[PDB]
């Protein structure tokens, strides 16, 4: 139960569907499955062909250049889980160069544990934007999809209605489906670990993705970790053993597995049937247990291995001694560094040389954890034990606090390393102790670390003068030991509301230093009031072919601006909702020019117009229109409105409104905005 | 007459005006004159001090850090000509770091034949824009003027009226003078070579600059070429011999000159008293004649010489054999190449290596005329007989039609040569015969020749469609041996009123070549009618570390619209 079929370890199928019937009954394939290179197949060769029995694949799965096939909903309706122990350039699902493959129907796929998915050169495939990979994968940014039918936008990959979840991702709701029929199932935000059932209840704590009954280890569909006899289990109870991270086997099983290479003979450690023991361990004639002892040499093929992915990496997983040379070349675009670290150099020695060529995203080398010694018994051509070229993101090699390095023979080869400055280079020379080896042009002294000023020399500001429209800085004028080499001063400035982070200045006359009255400076005019700015300065000096005087840069500093008379208080609306109440409302001004303290409010009693007092309204023409000195005032604080009381019925009022960004000394305030209003008659 | 004083050859004066009275009477100083490093001088130390006796200096003249002096019209009112045989970084007049020096008054200076003038760090000097150098010099674009009182625009350097010629040069009439009194004299457009007299009449065909009477070899002021006894002469009549390009001397004079190094012992050849003979020649015990014979090793100091100017060059003038190594380093800014050719390697051999470092304006090496062999017996470190770095204008080395090259040992070193494409580099490897020596990265395969598409491959347009609003070009689709490497098509377009000489296109599908219907095109909309356009295409491909497939460029074509 939970798995009615068998194991049937992975065999890959070619050229016709004849050997496909060898892999019918089995429920979970150990290893991987590849289906490839069937040019003489037909669409009718798949309609009489289905395998619902497969549920989980351990390692990976591949589809490559088979004609006549258009879907996968029939061949594998019920594949659900990919564990991904053995990966494939950090992928586990290969959909590639498949002519006529237009859809998947892979709705039952729920979680892919480790790896990613690459889809390429499949000019019929659609229904792809309807696939939320985050429900199935963790690192969705490692999924390359290109050269497909969706890339020429034609497919209406729709479903009739509600069912399929239309979830917002980037711009709007994305309807999630697999076919026009099959929606993409979404478990709720609490059943995410072990999957959910049909109504959405959480499964048992050892289920995964699907369960036949909610909260039942005996009625799951897929185990999260381990399987044992109708129960998904958290661990192997004694005397059982974890085999390939998915099940518990007895002693006799992994015992008799050893007896068949007479190829991967097996041993036991940590209640686990494993291939081999690491260093300091020994087999056992009784039970094949990795016993500790006194004193693991992974001798390469031809002493050499190009290393480019996890597929390369797991071949040297757990090794301690490398009897060969290593080549690091990853044309990448994605940091694999943690997974790179996870199966790498728990070693000290490399018998031959080390090569690092044209890798892109490798920012560091700290994943070499215990790496100490370079023997270099076989050197790189040009007499090198070390190589380095074309590493666009490499900045740090190691912290030389506790990391060490011993290099027996060979030399260093540093070229085209635009984020690798010479400081840690010479530190590596020092800690290597091999400084008396390197000739000229063993280090490219024009390309290595030429994107940021690095090394040592720091500028220090002597004086700061600020204004609302002026900036002056004063700092110590540094001079290199040849004072003629100073060409000028590179200055970078910008504004910065955060703190999470261009002009040039001629050098002055040096001419002495009892009183070198040459403290250099620059005036900025382009200032905004009350505004935070971020400024730093670099020294422009002449390059020399020798050990050049490294030149200085300044600290990034933050200086905020001041303030000034705020702008016009926008839209004064003066409504009189009562006979003595006038609401005046307004918008903030366009330029507050500082933190606004208050709003200066003036209301002025405008008398009636004086020409009306000497007119004869008893004559026809009686058309009446239904309409320093201290004025009454208000400092409206933290409000964009003000109702005014104690007002006359039938009296027009002038209103002068200003804002004020300064209140306590000598009020800096806005310019006058005007309106006029009239109270209601009683 | 014409020169009543004497020669008094060049000695340079330091630390006080005491030794200056050694050089009083003399008419034309052979060699050079430098006056330097006098801090404790006063302006009163010059009003009782004048030398009108000097008219011409042969080689050069230098003024360096002497205080209290403000002018020069008193010390040398009548210096007139600088010939300029021995130069000083292609200058013959050095005015440098002179505190209080505010004007010149050097009105009698008329022609400077060879060399230039450099002015620097003289924060008192003015009257500078009033000096037409074209009247006095030829290559006026080799004159360096900076760090002066003129550089902070204050001096009104005017004259009271007419006198001084106000000549349009660049923007308007430029008044030409030396002081507020001394105008700059301009001879007419017919008396230009030999100079003019006061009223403007032409001087004699052997005069130069000034003449006491117009058209009189016996009443010149300065000779054009040669002097003999009150007459400026075109050459030496017998039995006389040319000495230092300015006079005629007898056999007795240059004879007795030889008898004094017992340092420049002299011989005679080609009716000339000269220092030495070139290769294949022999002296004479009777008359010191460069007689031809069968079979000039300019053995250097420590086998090494940095070469930077003509002053470095004339030390190796006319050499044939170099027992040493040469360093070519000219942070220049001006092409010296003709005069560089004028006194250089009529040679075939170099015993040591050759170095070329950071030279800027050297577009070619054709001034190397006869060079064939490098022995390389002392190498550049790193086992090189040859060196090349940082040459921002170097494109051609030589024409390998007739130029040859023989290399014994050593290697090649090519870096940062941004207009030096690899084709002629491999041709140099071939004609050298030392192709089986160069390792990896002896040639910078990224920086050498990366400013213009060079190598081989030419695009050819199959079809042309024009309009007044549409342009379509179709060409033969080139495909490299890895068709994946083609990433796009770089196109450069612009209009062209003369013929004296930007968009991208994606690559189409290769997929076959019985019928590769992939003749690629671009439609242009931005057309003006009746307008001539200049269009050409480059192929954008993938770099590889190996011998990369060089990529194609098209021809600059001209298309006139409707």
């Amino acid at each position: 139960h939970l798995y009615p079929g068998e194991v049937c370890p992975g065999m890959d199928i070619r050229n016709n569907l004849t050997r496909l019937h060898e892999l019918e009954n089995c429920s979970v394939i150990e290893g991987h499955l590849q289906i490839l290179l069937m040019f003489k197949t037909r669409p009718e060769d798949f309609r009489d062909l289905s395998f619902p029995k497969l549920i989980m694949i351990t390692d990976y799965l591949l589809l490559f250049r088979v004609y006549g096939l258009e879907s996968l909903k029939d061949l594998f309706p019920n594949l659900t889980v990919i564990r991904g122990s053995r990966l494939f350039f950090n992928y586990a699902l290969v959909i590639f160069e498949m002519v006529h493959l237009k859809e998947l129907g892979l709705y039952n796929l729920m979680n892919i544990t480790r790896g990613s998915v690459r889809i390429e050169k499949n000019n019929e495939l659609c229904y792809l934007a309807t696939i939320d990979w985050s429900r199935i994968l963790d690192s969705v940014e490692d999924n390359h999809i290109v050269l497909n039918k969706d890339d020429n936008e034609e497919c209406g990959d729709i479903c009739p209605g509600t069912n399929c979840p239309a979830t917002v991702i980037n711009g709007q709701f994305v309807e999630r489906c697999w076919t026009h029929s099959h929606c993409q199932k979404v478990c709720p935000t609490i059943c995410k670990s072990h999957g959910c059932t049909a109504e959405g209840l959480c499964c048992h704590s050892e289920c995964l993705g699907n369960c036949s009954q909610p909260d039942d280890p005996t009625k799951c569909v897929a185990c999260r970790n381990f399987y044992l006899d109708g129960r998904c289990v958290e661990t192997c109870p004694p005397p059982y053993y974890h085999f390939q991270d998915w099940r518990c086997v007895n002693f006799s099983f992994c015992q008799d597995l050893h007896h068949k290479c007479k190829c991967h003979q097996y041993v036991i450690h940590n209640n686990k049937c494993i291939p081999e023991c690491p260093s300091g361990y020994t087999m056992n004639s009784s039970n094949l247990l990795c016993t500790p002892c006194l004193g693991k040499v992974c001798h390469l093929l031809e002493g050499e291995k190009t290393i480019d992915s996890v597929t390369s990496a797991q071949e040297l997983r757990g090794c301690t001694v490398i009897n060969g040379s290593l080549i690091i070349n990853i044309r990448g675009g994605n940091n694999l560094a943690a997974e790179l670290e996870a199966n790498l150099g728990l070693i000290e020695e490399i018998s031959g040389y080390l090569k690092i060529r044209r890798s892109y995203a490798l920012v560091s080398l700290s994943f070499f954890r215990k790496l100490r010694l370079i023997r270099g018994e076989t050197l790189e051509i040009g007499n090198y034990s070390f190589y380095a070229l074309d590493n666009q993101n490499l900045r740090q090699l190691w912290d030389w606090s506790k990391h060490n390095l011993t290099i027996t023979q060979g030399k260093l080869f540093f070229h085209y390393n635009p984020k690798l400055c010479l400081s840690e280079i010479h530190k590596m020379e020092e800690v290597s102790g091999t400084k008396g080896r390197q000739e000229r042009n063993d280090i490219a002294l024009k390309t290595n670390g030429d994107q940021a000023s690095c090394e040592n020399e720091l500028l220090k500001f002597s004086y700061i003068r600020t204004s609302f429209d002026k900036i002056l800085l004063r700092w110590e004028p540094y001079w290199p030991p040849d004072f003629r080499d100073l060409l000028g001063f590179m200055l970078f400035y910008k504004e910065a509301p955060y703190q999470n982070v261009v002009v040039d200045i001629d050098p002055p006359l040096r001419s002495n230093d009892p009183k070198s009255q040459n403290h250099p400076g620059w005036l900025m005019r382009g200032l905004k009031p009350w505004t935070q700015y971020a400024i730093f300065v670099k020294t422009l000096v002449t390059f020399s072919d020798e050990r050049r005087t490294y030149g200085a840069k300044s600290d990034i500093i933050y200086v905020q601006t001041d303030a000034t008379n705020p702008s016009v208080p926008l839209d004064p609306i003066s409504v009189s909702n009562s006979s003595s109440q006038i609401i005046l409302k307004w918008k903030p001004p366009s330029d507050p020019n500082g933190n606004i303290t208050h709003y200066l409010v003036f209301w002025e009693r405008q008398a009636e117009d004086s020409e009306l007092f000497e007119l004869d309204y008893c004559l026809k023409g009686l058309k009446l229109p239904s309409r320093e000195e201290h004025r009454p005032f208000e400092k409206v604080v933290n409000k964009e409105s003000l109702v005014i009381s104690g007002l006359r019925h039938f009296t027009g009022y002038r209103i002068e409104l200003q804002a004020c960004n300064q209140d306590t000394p000598e009020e800096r305030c806005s310019v006058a905005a005007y309106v006029s209003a009239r109270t209601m008659p009683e | 007459h014409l020169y009543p004083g004497e020669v008094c050859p060049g000695m340079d004066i330091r630390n006080n005006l005491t030794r200056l009275h050694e050089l009083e009477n003399c008419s034309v100083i052979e060699g050079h004159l430098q006056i330097l490093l006098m801090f404790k001088t006063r302006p009163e130390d010059f009003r009782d001090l004048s030398f009108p006796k000097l008219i011409m200096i042969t080689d050069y003249l230098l003024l360096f850090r002497v205080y209290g002096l403000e002018s020069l019209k008193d010390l040398f009112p009548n210096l007139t000509v600088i010939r300029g045989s021995r130069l000083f970084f292609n200058y013959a007049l050095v005015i440098f770091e002179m505190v209080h020096l505010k004007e010149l008054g050097l009105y009698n200076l008329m022609n400077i034949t060879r060399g230039s003038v450099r002015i620097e760090k003289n924060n008192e000097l003015c009257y500078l824009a009033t000096i037409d150098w074209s009247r006095i010099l030829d290559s006026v674009e080799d004159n360096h003027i900076v760090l002066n009182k003129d550089d902070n625009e204050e001096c009104g350097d005017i004259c009271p009226g007419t006198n001084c010629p106000a000549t349009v040069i660049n923007g308007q009439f430029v008044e030409r003078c030396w002081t507020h009194s001394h105008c700059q004299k301009v001879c007419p457009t017919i008396c230009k070579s030999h100079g003019c007299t006061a009223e403007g009449l032409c001087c004699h065909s052997e005069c130069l600059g000034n003449c006491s009477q117009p058209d009189d070899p016996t009443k010149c002021v300065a000779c054009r070429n040669f002097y003999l006894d009150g007459r400026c002469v075109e050459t030496c009549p017998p039995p006389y011999y040319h000495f230092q390009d300015w006079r005629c001397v007898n056999f007795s004079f240059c004879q007795d000159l030889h008898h004094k190094c017992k340092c420049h012992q002299y011989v005679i050849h080609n009716n000339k008293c000269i220092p030495e003979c070139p290769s294949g020649y022999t002296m004479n015990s009777s008359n010191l004649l460069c007689t031809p014979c069968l079979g000039k090793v300019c053995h250097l100091l420590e086998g090494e010489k940095t070469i930077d100017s003509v002053t470095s060059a004339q030390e190796l003038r006319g050499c044939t054999v170099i027992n040493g190594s040469l360093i070519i380093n000219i942070r220049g800014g001006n092409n010296l190449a003709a005069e560089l050719e004028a006194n250089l390697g009529l040679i075939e051999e170099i015993s040591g290596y050759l170095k070329i470092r950071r030279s800027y304006a050297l577009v070619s090496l054709s001034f190397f005329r006869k060079l064939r062999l490098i022995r390389g017996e002392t190498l550049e470190i790193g086992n090189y007989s040859f060196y090349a770095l940082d040459n921002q204008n170097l494109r051609q080395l030589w024409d390998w039609s007739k130029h040859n090259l023989t290399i014994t040992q050593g290697k090649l070193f090519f870096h940062y040569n941004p207009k030096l494409c690899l084709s002629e580099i491999h041709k140099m490897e071939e004609v050298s015969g030392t192709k089986g020596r160069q390792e990896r990265n002896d040639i910078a395969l990224k920086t050498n020749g990366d400013q213009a598409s060079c190598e081989n491959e030419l695009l050819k347009f199959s079809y042309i469609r024009t309009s007044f609003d549409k342009i379509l070009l179709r060409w033969e689709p080139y495909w490299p041996p890895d068709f994946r490497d083609l990433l796009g098509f770089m196109l450069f377009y612009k209009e062209a009123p003369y013929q004296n000489v930007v968009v991208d296109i994606d690559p189409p599908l290769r997929s076959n070549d019985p019928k590769s219907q992939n003749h690629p095109g671009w439609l242009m909309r931005g057309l003006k009618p009746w307008t001539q356009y200049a269009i050409f295409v480059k192929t954008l491909v993938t770099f590889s570390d190996e011998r990369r497939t060089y990529g194609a460029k098209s021809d600059i074509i001209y298309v006139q619209t409707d």
């Binding site: 002449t542 | 620097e120 921002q392």
Partner: peptide, 30 residues
Amino acid sequence: QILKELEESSFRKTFEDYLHNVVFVPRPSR
């Protein structure tokens, strides 16, 4: 772009150097 000015300043420096090299050793002869 303006790197000719950059090498021009070094040219100025070389011109500074050479005059100083002329001034330097006429004196030590011992």
